[model samples]
Target chain A: SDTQEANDIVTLANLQYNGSTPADAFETKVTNIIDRLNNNGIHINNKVACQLIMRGLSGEYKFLRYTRHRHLNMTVAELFLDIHAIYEEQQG
Target chain B: SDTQEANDIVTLANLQYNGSTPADAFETKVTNIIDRLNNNGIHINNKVACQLIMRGLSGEYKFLRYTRHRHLNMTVAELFLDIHAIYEEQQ
Candidate 1:
């Protein structure tokens, strides 16, 4: 029963990002990657998180640039971090 | 005293970081940039934040590579975003 319950939980986690990849896709991609790792029993480290953010931002920025859209020249990954910093300030 | 109080608020925001740039400097740099913008009466937009993250991560990653440290290869700015995604999951 314990094993079955664990399997069910993994299935549920996987269901979160089922067939949804919109233009604002950073959040979805990030969540999917993190969830897959955690679900696979792999521990999520700070380094892994950071690396994923960098690569994700780079890839997404490339896409934005390719479309000739100046709107998303900046990366969402970076801004998300800044928001965290802001949250930290508010907390302190 | 209204102007004085407003200035005091500005001072309070500026006091958050004072000459503390450690090895893990991404957090500091990110905060500093954001604070500087708000201080200068520049609105902080999502695009600006994203661009900063991209540039900051790119710069920091280059520094890590220059130091020949393969362990710290990934960029913190990116990871910070990933963490936010994870938090969103919890929420």
Candidate 2:
């Protein structure tokens, strides 16, 4: 059943990015958690879900947080792709 | 006379970059020190003089140090120009 108990259990499993995990993998985990909660009847809006994704980024990637202000309507995938672009640029 | 005393005095004035001073100013200071020593007969080679200019770069500009390896014969002006290029690109 879609009960509070089930919601708490699933929500507890929504982990954070610790700078160790690759960005794409972390993005997948966040999306999956959101979808799982929605399927179980725990409502999460796009803005809140984006916050969950941004919560644990390290200092080096902190500049990406600017996107929140500049691009209020950008999606999760767009944010993650922008992160990948930054990671690639740093390779040189 | 071009005594060790004068060289030491002028070389002592050769300061480091603490990520505070702008790159061009530091470059000019380093070049002036080198020239001052040269005119006084303290012959600092290009390789050693380049080291003098590179001595105090901050961590952010450390990547420019790699030019030392790839372009062994590069001059101090070339190195500073490259640093400016990097500084501009970063801006």
Candidate 3:
């Protein structure tokens, strides 16, 4: 399951892989993960954002995704800030 | 049966109400009611009362003569409002 989940992340990231942005699409996929957790009364912490999503990428997802290769060295931390930004904006 | 039958809460309340509040709108209305009440510090704390709310909403309360709101033209929101008002007053 982890392997598929890892692949699934790549599929989501691969949508970006040095490619055009799907900012809405990406947020939706991640939001779904959060929604599933929420239905079970679980909330996502920054720790999960960092651990499960931020540090979980490999190959194209880590470096080649999100930036269209414009920012080829994108770290999980960078992606995270964008996500945390989404949640806070909603909170506001 | 006519006099005691006149005492049924659901039926008695239905006579005072009108307008169809579609059954499909059940949860949204319920949650909205709960949320509004919760903000005012009202909780559905009683098990019997909570069960009746759902049972009445779903048209399944065991002792009730009827459940469909269409007959009285009373929407679920109005129905829930009547119940909620009584519940709040009783609290």
Candidate 4:
């Protein structure tokens, strides 16, 4: 499924932190966030996963539309990283 | 292609009344509805057409889910017909 594949990309990107930080640290961060959401009774079903991906994509699209600046080669990868950070902040 | 095919099914359903009415009447009804939408500045581009079909399908799914009613084999056809009627009423 397109949505599933998209979500996987986001998950991978978040776990890798856009390759900026070490893999272990990134994985721990994502796991912590997921655990928090799960504890709060927020089920991470496919539909919700897809919606989150769409929301992140829409924000990136809007920003790029106004900036007229092309993202680097791994722009989507960076987007996933940014969204993961936001998700973590939301949990705090 | 999936979206296009879905829209085509909806269009056929509206025109044919789920194959209850005659083909000519169905075609005429569909054409009239399309023309009215166009006249209202609602350009029926592929995306818009696909979205309309999706909306109709979603409503059908919701109804079936809540009612615990399984549609007949040609239920989508009937749903499309209903959507066409609603579209005409909207226009």
- lDDT top scorer: 2
lDDT of 3 by residue, A1-92 (tens): 31222223223322322212344555667666555544443343333333344333443356422443254344544775565454455444
**Positional deviation of residue A75's Cα in model 1 after best superposition, in angstroms:** 15
Each model's lDDT comes to 0.37, 0.57, 0.38, 0.38
lDDT of 3 by residue, B40-87 (tens): 432322222233343424222222225432324444455566554444
List DockQ, one per candidate, in order: 0.01, 0.01, 0.01, 0.04
User: A1-92, model 2: which lDDT tens digit per residue?
Assistant: 31332333233224344455666676676667656656554444455445545544555677665557666666777877876776666667
- Backbone clash count for every predicted candidate, in the order shown: 7, 0, 2, 1
* Candidate 4 segments exceeding 4 Å error: A1-69, A72-75, A84-92, B1-68, B72-75, B85-91
Q: What is chain B's TM-score across the candidates, in the order shown?
A: 0.34, 0.73, 0.32, 0.34
lDDT of 2: 0.57
Per-model fnat list:
0.00, 0.00, 0.00, 0.00
Residues A4-91 of candidate 1: C-alpha lDDT, one tens digit per residue: 3223223322322222233245355555655654655433333324333432233223332233233233454653454344344544
Instruction: Name every residue pair that clashes in candidate 1.
Output: A49-B79, A50-B79, A53-B78, A74-B51, A75-B50, A75-B51, A78-B53
In angstroms, how far off is B50's CA in candidate 3? Answer: 31
TM-score of each: 0.22, 0.41, 0.24, 0.26
- Candidate 3: how many backbone clashes? 2
Location of the lowest summed lDDT over 10 successive residues in candidate 2 chain A? A1-10
lDDT at residue A41 of model 4 (Cα atoms): 36
Tell me the lDDT of model 4 at B2.
15
Give lDDT tens digits, candidate 4, residues B18-51. 2344444654655564454454432333322322
By DockQ rank, best first, the candidates go 4, 1, 3, 2
Positional deviation of residue B22's Cα in model 2 after best superposition, in angstroms: 1.7
